[PDB]
Every structure is written in C-alpha cells, then in structure tokens.
Design a protein around this nucleic acid. Structure first.
Lengths: 49, 61, 146, 146, 195, 141, 33, 178, 84, 107, 103
RNA sequence: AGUGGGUAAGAGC
RNA sequence: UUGGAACGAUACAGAGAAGAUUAGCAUGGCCCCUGCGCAAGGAUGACA
C-alpha cells in the first residue's frame, strides 16, 4: 500500500502535510499491532531494528 | 472345538439364507408366515424385515 | 416452474386431442381425469420443501485411523506432494537481499528459485504430475458443448 | 537503463513481441477491480508494459547501512546463538515440513487458525535477544520452570 | 398457517425489517466517519448493505421492465445520428468478425489467457472453482484451435448464459461490485476484449 | 435463551455436569433478561445444534441458583463455564481471567472454535487449553 | 436430571469435588473463617 | 549427444558425489535430464576386477570406447529388474572377495564362459543357488569385519548391507536427547 | 412369457452378485476357513511387494512371481476348458 | 397373468410384476443403512427444551423485562411493576462448616 | 532488441559416436566442423556457481573450445557483454586452431 | 500518569 | 498431647509440540483387449 501511494502520489505528498501525518499514524498503527501480537503489553523502549 | 463348529454352521446357514426365494407379495408372505406358526408383525417391523424374517425361518427349517 | 408446466400440459393436451379426434368422453370424463392429475403435478411441484435435519459438526478426532495405501494413495501423494521447484521456492537466501520483481505485490518471492547460490547449476524443471486439469464432469460438459 | 517512463527494460523484455498486441491494458487494469475481490494498489500501471518505476535497492542498502549492518542486526538476533561460522552460506525455510504438509489436510477452523501462527513463533524466537529484554518490557521478570 | 398468526408474523417481520434497515444505515455511516469498529461488525454490515442494494436493484429492474425504457425514441435517434455522423466523418471501418484465418488469432488468445491467469499468480491455495478455471485455461492453451473454435461458436450462437455471482468490496466509503463469471464464458469474453 | 434448557437448582447443575462423560458442558451463568446474556443465549442457540456431537448447552439463572456465585465468582453480567468429566476447564483467552468467558462474543465461529479447542485439550487430560484466537484486544479499528 | 428437586441437606458446591477460584480480591464477599 | 532423442537417458545416477557439479555443467543443453546422487555405494568400481576388463584396458594402447552387455542372455527368462538385482549382488560379492566369488561363479566345470559374453551360463536353479551362496558370502564377510552373526542381521539390514549401508557413532553422547 | 430387464436392473443385479461374493469371501477369511489373500504380484509389482526381499535372492523372487502369474493364467485357462 | 422372474425364476402374476421387480433386487445394505439411520435417530438427545419449558422461560423473561412487556415500566431487572441460603466459597477449610449449615437447613 | 521496436513498438561437444557375435563393440570417433548451440537463456539457475565451474573448466582444459563458448554465452545471457568478449579473446589466443571460437 | 490485559496443567503425600 | 492452613506445601514430573500418522494388495469406476460360456443372429464356401 505504501509503495503504491508514494509512487503514484510522488511530489504530491510533500505539500499534503495531512498525508504525512496519516502515513506516520498508520505506520505507528502497524507497529502497535505487531507489538501487541508479540506480547499483550506495550513495550516502553521498543527498538526499530 | 464347538466354537468353530457353531460358527461354521451359522456360516452355511447364512449362505443358505442368501440362496432362498421368497415371494414379493405381502399377502402371500403374511399367509406363509401364519402357516409357519409365527406372528406376522414383530413389534411393528417393516415389510422388508418381515420378508427377511420369513427367509430366515425357511432357512432354519 | 413455467416451461416444465407447459410441457406437461402439452402432453395431456395431446391426449385430449387423441381422444377428441375419435369423439370419446363427450361429457369430458377424460378431460377431468387429465385435469385432476395436472393439478396434482402442479401441487407436487409447488409443494413446500420437507423438513430436513441439519448434520451436527463431527467431533474432533484422536488416536489412529487405518487408511489404506496403493495405487490411488501413490497418485494422490504425487499430486499433493512437494515438488522440486516448489521445494526450492520456499527457500530464502540469508543475507543476500533480492529485488522484488512483483510490483503488484511485495509479499511474493520465488526464494532460491532463480536466485544465486541456490545449489542448482541447471534450471529446475516443471513436475508435470502437478499439471492443472479439469474435472470429469467439466470434461463431459465441454464435450457436450462441442 | 531505468530512466524512461516506458522503462528501457521493456524494450529488452522476453515477451516484447506478444505484448505489442496487448492494447488498452491501462483501462483493463483499472476495471480489474470489478472482477477480483482484492483492490490493486497499482491499478494505474503494468509492470510488464510500463516497466518498474521505482527502485528499492538504494533504500534497502542504506537501511542495512544505518542499522549498523548485518553484524549489528544479527547481534540483535539469536544468530550468534546458533554458532554459525558465517552469515554467507545460509538460507531460510518459509514453512516447516509438517507445517507445509498441514496446509491442506482437512483441518477445522480453530486448528488452521492456530496453525497459521507458526511463522510468528519463528519470528519471535529469531528476535528473542532483543524483544525479551528488560528495557523494552519493564516489570517483574519470571524464570521458566527448567 | 392461520390468518391471525400470519398477521402476527408479518407485523413482526415489518418491525424487524425497519430495525434492520435503520441499523445498517446507521453502522455504515458510523464506519464512513472513521469510527473504531470491530471486524465481525463490518462483515455483518456489508452483508446487510449487499442485501439492501440487491433489493433496490430488484425494484429498479422491475420498474424498468414495467414502465419500459426511459430513453425516448427521439433522443435515441439523436444519439445514434450523432454517432453515425462521427463514424462517417472519421472514415471508420466496422470491426470484422474474427476470421478463421486471422493472423493474430493466437496472440490475442495467449494474452487473454495470461490476463485470466494473473488472478492466481500469488494464490498459494486453490479451491475447486479456481482449479477448474486453471484447468480450462490450460486446456485452452494446449489446444488453441479448439479454444478458438469454441469462442467463435459461442459468439455466433450463444445468447443465454449462466448465473453470475455478485459480491461487494467494502471501502468504508462505497461498496464496489465484483462479478463472478463462469470460466467457460470468461475465456470467450477475455479473447473478445483483447481482439 | 428460552430455547436452551434451563436448570433451576444447584443439584440439577451438579447432575448435568456429572452425567456428561464424553461431551464438554457449556453453562451460561447469568440472567436471561441481560442483553449481554441475550447475546450469549442467541449465539449458543445458533450453535447449540452444530456442536451437539461433542458439547451440550445448559442455562442457569444465578438469581434462582446463587449456589456458585461465591465459589465461581459469578458476578459479571454473563459468564461462560466449560466442564469435562466433572472438572472445570480453563481457557487462556488472553484477557487475564482464564477461568471463564465473562464477555459477549459476537461471532458464533469464534465460540465454536473455543468449544472445539476446549474439547481437544480436555480430552487429552489437560485442564487449561490455549484459545485459538487472542482476546487481549477487541481488534476494533 | 431435569424436573427433579434437590436432596435435603446437600451443598451443590460440594458433592462434585469442585474447587472455586479468586481472580482478585475486589470481587466476591469477604471470606469468613 | 551421440544417442538419438528416444534412447537418451532421463535419470543419470552417479555413485560418487563428485559428478553432481561437472555433469550439470556439461548437460546444460539437456534440462529434462535429472541427475541423482547416490548415498548408497553401488559396487561398480569393482567391475573392472573381472578378468575380461582389467586386461582389456591395460593393453589398450590408445583411448577409445567399447560396449558390453552385462546381462549376457538372462533377459530371455528374467525381467531387467531381476537382472539388475542379480548383477548388483554379483558385483557386491566380487568387490567383497574377488577370490571366493570367482569360485562361486562356477559351481561345476560344466559351466563354461563363452567368449561372446562375460558371466558364465547357468541353469535357472543353478543361478538361484549361486545367488544364495553369494549372499551368504557377503553376509559372512560383513560379519567378519563387524563381529556380527549372519543370523543377527534382519531382512532390511541384509538389504542395506548388500546395497552398502554402514552404522557408526564416534559421539554417542547425543543420547542426552532422551 | 419370458420378461426382459432394463440395463439398470442388469447392472444392479451384477453388482449385487459381485458384492455378495466379495462379502462371502471376506467373511470366510474372517472365520479362518480361508487363508488371507496374497498380494497379486506382477513384474511391475515385484519391487513394490517384494522389494525388501528381492535383493536377498532375485532369481527366486522372479521364479515365485512368475509362478503366481502362471497359476492365475492357468486357472483362467482351465476354467475356460472346463466350461467348453 | 403369469410371468417368470428374470432374477428368481418363479411364476408370478403380471399385476404385481413391476412391483415384484422393485422389491426383487432391493439391496440388503439398504436395510442396513435404514437400520443405522433409525438407530442414530433414536440416539439423538433433545438439544432444546420442550414447549412447557420455553413457555415458562418466556413468562420469566417477561416478568423481568418490563420494557418489552407488561403495563408498568420498572427498571431492567425488577419484578415489581427470613431464610438466606448459605453457599460454599470453594475452600476445603470451610467444607465442614458448609456441611453443618446444610444439615441445620433441614426441615 | 529488434530495430523495428520504438518507444511504443551453450556447453557443446565435438566428439560423437555412431551406434551400429563379439563382446567388444568399439565406436569410431566422429568430429563436427561446427558446434553452435543457440543462446537458450534462462536454463542456468546459479549464475555464480556456473561461472565458477566454467572458469575451472577453462583452467583445467584450456584447449577445449566448448568451454570458452559456454562461458562466453553464459556471460552474454547474464548481461556482462564485455567479460564475454574478453573470455572469447582469451580463448582465441588459447585455441587458434578451432574456428568456432573465432566465429 | 497509571493498574492490569504476565495464574502452565497434572500425581498423591 | 494440642491448632492456623489446605484456591496452600514441597517431592516426583514437565514436548504447555503436533497429529485420527503410512506402506502394500485387492475390490470400486470408465475404457478397451482376450478366452470360454449363454442368448440369439448375420454374410459366405463346397462335385458325381
């Protein structure tokens, strides 16, 4: 989904700050879902590696 | 011993049962069963069960 | 239920003609004797469906159940077995990153299939035992539609 | 090489002769959403006809570089716990023998749903020295029985 | 069924239907706004919306059949005359029927089969419908001439077709229709589109 | 709700638990008039016949049968208990309370999966079974 | 068995070997010794 | 390449693992010809120990290529599967002893090896007796080098020994698995 | 007058007789009056039925399987001759 | 009339002829399948309560859900508009106390 | 690429052996003037392993024209069309007698 | 900021 | 001798994995083929 959006809408993301906020929010949503999948408790200092 | 003898006896009894002709008419089957001295219906059995009972009775006799 | 009904009526209509052309049952006794059975057939076709019990879900299985082997088992094992190209497909090379060749989906890769270090100098051939073929009834329908 | 919008790679594509007779493929790709149950992120371009319009080689190169490289990334993992002399001659296996053989054995919904989580278990085990750390999960630590 | 009992059931069904419609048109609008909803809720709402849309479509088709076409004769004549004038002005030659000796009779079939097969390029598992479709595709690919002959026969004679299924992809803003067609007709339609 | 069998005193509940030798007993503890209990009742009635082979469904009103409220913590609006051969079975649902299903589940497929997993685990002699689906998060999005 | 009254002087909590549980201390009445 | 397409092989099995790489290199034009490695050691290197082969190759002053028919005439009465099994048993025995095996090859002076082929011509029952004697030879010699009774071996074990299976364990402490 | 029967009834009668004979043989094996049937081995079937034992002494195995095949063939021929 | 059964070889009247055929080749495993069907039918257990229980349950629910029934609208679970039962706490220590309380509960 | 197109439109041998009351059946060697297998691209899975093996063949059998031809065609189908030219030039400097390398 | 969503089940002594 | 606790307490135990697992033959289905039997039935050869 991310490559489709970014390749289709390149040069149009930069002016759409709402899109940047939505993108980072959705990425955090995905990370939160994976972390909940690992353990049923939010990590405090989870690493990005 | 008696176990082999009895199981073989029942084996050929069943084989005889498979090779005995019984009429498909329900009335004739009822008359034959009455002649044999057995009740026509056994606790509300179906006609196929009645025919099977008549066949087994004929096989034994 | 229309077309079928028509056929039935036609048949009975024919009978009526085959009677009326010889001037029999001028009162219409054959007419009633055919119309009542036509109504009976219509009622049977339109009858409410009977009561059909639902099958409870079978209980989970445990222990062992003896299943035979033989030619059918061999054929089914060949059909459902892991093929060499399929076995090489789900092998992913450690460390060496591969560019995703499927734009429409990044979640699909061939693994070692076509990748360097796969241990195959030659190309892995296609196991024709996994060929896709139609059912028997589909073959029958295709032959009818030919 | 990867500059023109109808990427030059399409000139050298294997099926460059049979693709020339494929006309109106953008409209077909757009309308494909009415036939397939899955929405297509690349509803607008065709990889075969138009080529690959994006390269992730540099992005993944710099992502490996930023994370400290394979050495640091594997330091975060159980790789050194496998005592493998090097990271070069290694490969993964997406599914286990029983896991792959169980992809179709007439299982129930609960059974298959539970079975679908095995790759998650392998993933958690591969990242144990990092996920199972005191800093990330603050609170009381419990040792296993044995 | 007794008449009072039938009236009881009819009134109960009317009340349940009103509740069902209101619940569907409330949950759908809640989902459109971005509200946090469960997964089974979305599936149930999509089912309800599909049933509602199909009831509306049944009513629309019945109204079209009962009241006749909505396009008047004069408007149709104007449209057709405009199209005729455009085609004549462009020196356009009508598309011929695919001949039995067409030079590109094979490339189009190959492209249509490739397009049909791309539906399963990633599908690790196939049910009976998918494997039957793949078998038909492969059988047509092994004997291209027989496939083309069947395509021509269906174009020339086939007018009645089998029932096509309908499903709806939920985008939480609109319900996109997805149509399920039999593979036998699908190959013919794909070749026709390519040609 | 009203379709499923109802138990009126604690002795009947004991007899129902004891009399099942090869089926898991699923008992809904709550009040028939409770909306959450109503959801449990409708789901159970929907799947009361599908899982008849390896399960059975009983309904107990804790107001008329409070005899377990102290021991089984029967104070939530609706609870679900699973028993196998006179032995209460725990389910690691992921909510932190393995003893019972204290919340209403909308999907009947999820409850069928739960019952089947309970039957599989308890048949093998185990007392706690891991739920096929995690429930520490409602997955609402 | 359905439709049958309980025996006199029988504890339904007993007669089965059942054992309760305590998920927490906030729920349930205070235990009395 | 010399043979026609119909008679070209489809499986090439090599006893040694050293041919897995080179063959695939030189068979790069034949993709439908799968190459199989063999963990079991078929005693084919001992076929030169036959008196008809070592002398022939030692006095061959120039490289060339020759054809033989290892199944002399047995195919007239037994299927090629039985012929292959008998041949592999004979080669196993020849690799084992090469002296008592030669004695077992001829049970009587009547059995004469004609120059047309290699193995002596024997009656069917005589072939059965020679086969069982060679099996006894192989089992006894394996027992000699493993201190195991012939009767101690089982049918599957005897099959493995004829094929060439061995059992060894320098590090048995993996018994800690149990 | 003699009465014919439809092809459906012919198929059903033949199937019933064959199933009766098969059940008869199976229950004869059940009661010990009949030895359990031996696998039918041909040249192709050889290495599948007697694979673990054909390596012991291949020529004896070939003789045994050919003897079984010839026994079946000669039983068929003698049944034909007796029916002649 | 009189016809010879092609499967039995007996002189049978033609009036029953077709019927004589239908029940002539009837496969006994059909009888076996019917027997197992009737046995599994009698092996069922009543998953749902009878009519009296359903009617009583609906009466009980109506007496409580006055927002759906009745004339007077009280709260969700109130019927309107001495002896207190003692229950074991699940602790083996209090087993004897509960037993003697139940004994004292006797009439 | 075909020049008509616009923006919008291996390891061979040299020795063959003929197949036809004795035990020895010698086969005379047969040589062919040309041995040119087509490009047959895509049949090589491990490009690096095949390249290493062909380099080993070239080292061990420097006077084997099929080795040079196969190595060069593997480089060509890989896309490294300059190393293929270099390999062929080395082979020509190493196998001047066989004209297949020069072709 | 914060509680939890982190009970292995089993055998009798 | 005489009590708290027992939803506790150690000892033993711990794969809390995952399965109704897999080999052979025959029956079963369609298509032949071959032999015999049964029911019949065709075309054809042969003087004094």
């Amino acid at each position: 989904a991310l490559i489709g959006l970014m390749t289709y809408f390149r040069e149009a993301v930069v002016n759409t700050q709402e899109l940047l906020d939505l993108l980072v929010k959705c990425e955090n949503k995905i990370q939160t879902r994976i972390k909940i999948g690992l353990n049923s408790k939010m990590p405090s200092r989870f690493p990005p590696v | 011993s008696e176990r082999q003898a009895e199981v073989l006896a029942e084996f050929e009894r069943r084989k005889r049962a498979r090779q005995i002709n019984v009429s498909t008419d329900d009335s004739e089957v009822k008359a034959c069963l009455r002649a044999l001295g057995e009740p026509i219906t056994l606790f509300g059995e179906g006609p196929a069960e009645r025919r099977e009972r008549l066949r087994n009775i004929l096989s034994v006799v | 239920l229309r077309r079928k009904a028509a056929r039935l009526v036609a048949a009975k209509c024919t009978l009526a003609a085959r009677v009326d052309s010889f001037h029999e049952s001028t009162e219409g006794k054959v007419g009633y004797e055919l119309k009542d059975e036509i109504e009976r057939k219509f009622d049977k076709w339109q009858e409410p469906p009977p009561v059909k019990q639902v099958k409870p879900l079978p209980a989970p299985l445990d222990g062992q159940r003896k299943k035979r082997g033989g030619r059918r088992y061999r054929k089914m094992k060949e059909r459902l077995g892991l093929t060499e190209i399929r076995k090489q497909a789900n092998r992913m090379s450690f460390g060496e990153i591969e560019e995703d060749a499927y734009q429409e989906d990044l979640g699909f890769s061939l693994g070692h299939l076509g990748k360097s270090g796969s241990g195959r100098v030659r190309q892995t051939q296609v196991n024709e035992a996994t060929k896709a073929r139609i059912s028997k009834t589909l073959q029958r329908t295709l032959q009818k539609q030919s | 090489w990867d500059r023109g919008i109808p990427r030059i790679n399409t000139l050298f594509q294997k099926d460059r002769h049979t693709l020339a007779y494929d006309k109106g493929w953008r409209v077909r790709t757009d309308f494909k959403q009415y036939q397939v149950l899955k929405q297509n992120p690349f509803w607008w371009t065709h990889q075969r006809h138009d080529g690959k319009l994006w390269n992730l080689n540099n992005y993944r190169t710099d992502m490996i570089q930023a994370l400290g490289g394979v050495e640091g990334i594997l330091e975060h993992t159980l790789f050194k716990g496998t005592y493998f002399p090097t990271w070069e001659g290694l490969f993964w296996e997406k599914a286990s023998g029983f896991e792959e053989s169980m992809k179709w054995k007439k299982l129930t919904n609960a059974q298959r749903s539970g079975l679908n989580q095995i790759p998650n278990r392998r993933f958690t085990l591969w990242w144990s020295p990092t996920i199972n750390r005191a800093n990330v999960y603050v609170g009381f630590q419990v040792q296993l029985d044995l | 069924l007794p008449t009072p009992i039938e009236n009881m059931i009819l009134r109960y069904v009317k009340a349940k239907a009103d509740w069902w419609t209101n619940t569907a048109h409330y949950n759908r609008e809640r989902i459109r706004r971005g509200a946090t909803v469960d997964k089974t809720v979305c599936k149930k709402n999509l089912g309800r919306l599909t049933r509602l849309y199909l009831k509306a479509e049944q009513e629309r088709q019945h109204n079209y059949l009962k009241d006749g076409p909505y396009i008047t004769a004069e408007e149709a004549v104007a449209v057709y005359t405009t199209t005729v004038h455009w085609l004549e002005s462009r020196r356009f030659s009508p598309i011929p029927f695919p001949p039995l000796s067409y030079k590109h009779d094979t490339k189009l079939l190959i492209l249509a089969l490739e397009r049909l097969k791309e539906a399963y390029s990633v599908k690790s598992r196939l049910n009976q419908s998918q494997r039957e479709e793949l078998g038909l595709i492969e059988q047509a690919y092994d004997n291209p001439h027989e496939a083309l002959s069947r395509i021509k026969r269906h174009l020339l004679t086939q007018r009645a077709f089998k029932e096509v299924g309908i499903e709806f992809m939920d985008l939480y803003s609109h319900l996109v229709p997805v149509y399920d067609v039999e593979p036998l007709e699908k190959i013919t339609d794909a070749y026709l589109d390519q040609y | 709700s009203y379709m499923l069998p109802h138990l009126h005193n604690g002795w009947q509940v004991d007899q129902a638990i004891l009399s099942e030798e090869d089926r898991v007993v699923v008992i809904r503890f709550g009040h028939d008039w409770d909306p959450t209990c109503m959801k449990m009742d409708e789901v159970l009635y929907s799947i009361a016949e599908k899982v008849k082979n390896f399960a059975v469904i009983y309904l107990v009103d804790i107001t008329e049968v409070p005899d377990f409220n102290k021991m089984y913590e029967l104070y939530d609006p609706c609870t679900v208990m699973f028993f196998f051969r006179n032995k209460h079975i725990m389910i690691d649902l992921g909510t932190g309370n393995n003893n019972k299903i204290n919340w209403a589940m909308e999907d009947k497929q999820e409850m069928v999966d739960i019952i089947e997993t309970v039957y599989r685990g308890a048949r093998k002699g185990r007392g706690l079974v891991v739920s096929p689906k995690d429930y520490s998060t409602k997955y609402r999005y | 068995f359905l439709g049958m009254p309980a025996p006199l002087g029988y504890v339904p909590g007993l007669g089965r070997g059942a054992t309760g549980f305590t998920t927490r201390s906030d729920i349930g009445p205070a235990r009395d010794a | 390449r010399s043979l026609p397409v119909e008679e070209q092989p489809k499986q090439i099995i090599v006893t040694r693992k050293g041919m897995l790489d080179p063959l695939e290199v030189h068979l790069l034009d034949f993709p439908n010809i799968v190459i199989k490695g063999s963990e079991l050691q078929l005693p084919f290197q001992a076929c030169l120990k036959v008196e008809k082969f070592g002398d022939l190759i030692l006095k061959a002053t120039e490289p060339q290529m020759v054809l033989f028919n290892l199944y002399d005439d047995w195919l007239k009465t037994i299927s090629s599967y039985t012929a292959f099994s008998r041949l592999i048993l004979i080669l196993r025995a020849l690799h084992v002893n090469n002296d008592r095996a030669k004695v077992i090859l001829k049970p009587d002076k009547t059995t004469i090896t004609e120059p047309h082929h290699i193995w002596p011509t024997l009656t069917d029952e005589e072939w059965i007796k020679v086969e069982v004697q060679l099996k006894d030879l192989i089992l006894a010699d394996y027992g000699k080098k493993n201190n195991v009774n012939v009767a101690s071996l089982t049918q599957s074990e005897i099959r493995d020994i004829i094929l060439g299976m061995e059992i060894s364990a320098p590090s048995q402490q993996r018994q800690q698995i149990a | 007058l003699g009465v014919y029967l439809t092809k459906k009834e012919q198929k059903k009668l033949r199937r019933q007789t064959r199933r009766e004979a098969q059940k008869e043989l199976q229950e004869k094996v059940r009661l010990g009056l009949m030895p359990p049937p031996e696998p039918k081995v041909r040249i192709s079937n050889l290495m599948r039925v007697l694979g673990t034992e054909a390596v012991q002494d291949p020529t004896k195995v070939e003789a045994h399987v050919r003897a079984q095949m010839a026994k079946r063939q000669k039983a068929h021929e003698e049944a034909n001759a007796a029916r002649k | 009339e009189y016809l010879v059964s092609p499967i039995t070889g007996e002189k049978i009247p033609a009036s029953k002829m077709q019927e004589h055929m239908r029940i002539g080749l009837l496969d006994p495993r059909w009888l076996e399948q019917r027997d197992r069907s009737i046995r599994e039918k009698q092996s069922d257990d009543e998953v749902y309560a009878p009519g009296l229980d359903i009617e009583s349950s609906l009466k009980q629910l109506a007496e409580r859900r006055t927002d759906i029934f009745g004339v007077e609208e009280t709260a969700i679970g109130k019927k309107i508009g001495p002896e207190e039962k003692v229950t074991w706490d699940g602790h083996s220590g209090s087993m004897a106390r509960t037993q003697q309380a139940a004994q004292a509960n006797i009439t | 690429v075909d020049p008509r197109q616009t923006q919008f439109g291996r390891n061979t041998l040299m020795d063959m052996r003929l197949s036809q009351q004795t035990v020895v059946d010698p086969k005379g060697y047969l040589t062919d003037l040309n041995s040119m297998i087509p490009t047959h691209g895509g049949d090589i899975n491990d490009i690096k392993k095949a390249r290493l093996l062909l380099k080993s063949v070239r080292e061990t059998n420097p006077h084997h024209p099929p080795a040079w031809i196969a190595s060069a065609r593997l480089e060509e189908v890989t896309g490294k069309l300059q190393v293929a030219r270099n390999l062929i030039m080395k082979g020509t400097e190493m196998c001047p007698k066989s004209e297949d390398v020069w072709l």
